[PDB]
Design a protein around this ligand. Sequence first.
Ligand SMILES: [Cu+2]
Ligand SMILES: [Cu+2]
Ligand SMILES: [Cu+2]
Ligand SMILES: [Zn+2]
Lengths: 151, 151
Amino acid sequence: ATSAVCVLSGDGPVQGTIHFEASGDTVVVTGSITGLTEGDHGFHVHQFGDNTQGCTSAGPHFNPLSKKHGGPSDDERHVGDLGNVTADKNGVAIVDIVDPLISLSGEYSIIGRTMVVHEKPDDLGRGGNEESTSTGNAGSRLACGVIGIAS
Amino acid sequence: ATSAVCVLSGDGPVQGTIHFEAKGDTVVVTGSITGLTEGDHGFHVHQFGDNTQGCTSAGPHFNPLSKKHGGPSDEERHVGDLGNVTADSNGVAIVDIVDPLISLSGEYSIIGRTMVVHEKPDDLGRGGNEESTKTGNAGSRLACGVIGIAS
Ligand SMILES: [Cu+2]
Ligand SMILES: [Cu+2]
Ligand SMILES: [Cu+2]
Ligand SMILES: [Zn+2]
């Protein structure tokens, strides 16, 4: 696949559409998320594209290299660690990310996995407790969707 | 992947959970769908895993080999053609299908694509009209979901 899309939904007001495109040797992530509280929100690819129990069944962060959680610019990060998205005063977050670890094909493919937007800011693995090294203390999953092949 | 899952949702009361498991050179499809009218309902893999416009944005049947529509046992069929599921008097359809053309990996992978349950029976390409060889005359899309990787 060269293009993918994800519609985020949850039990609250948070909604959004995220587009993925393979450009050259990298992946470009764009889109927008609405209904968020102003501020930073963790934004990650979780391992499973299973929404049988809402976003809970998406599992932990996608992590084929078995590393600890970090920010997108770190060497020590999960493949799914895309950092934070920032919502304005109106609750809108514009997504504009380029990432060197995710892919749309092969071992690092995120097709069929779940994009999640979280309640709190991701501390990028620097919070100092065990939880920071797993999830960045980003908290609950406000909305999520399975990443599918797009035209 | 060797296992996948799909949660079917729509604008009406139809919902369901479908599981997929690679076994030998086949995929075993199991699960249940509820809220259906009694009788047969077309059941297909559509090409795109795009839910931006509900089930409509899923596109046509998955058809990488450019064939006409058929039933699952026909040589001339779409890869996505899984025939019909049957709902009982209480609106419950039990899914139990073994298919050799769909796959969870490689060229015919259905991960990231959409499963759709239709309003009418699939005529399996033997309807006598032109629509029969395209969609089986299965009509409306009652519910759909993107096929994701499962644990
Ligand atoms: Cu997360
Ligand atoms: Cu169909
Ligand atoms: Cu077909
Ligand atoms: Zn992580």
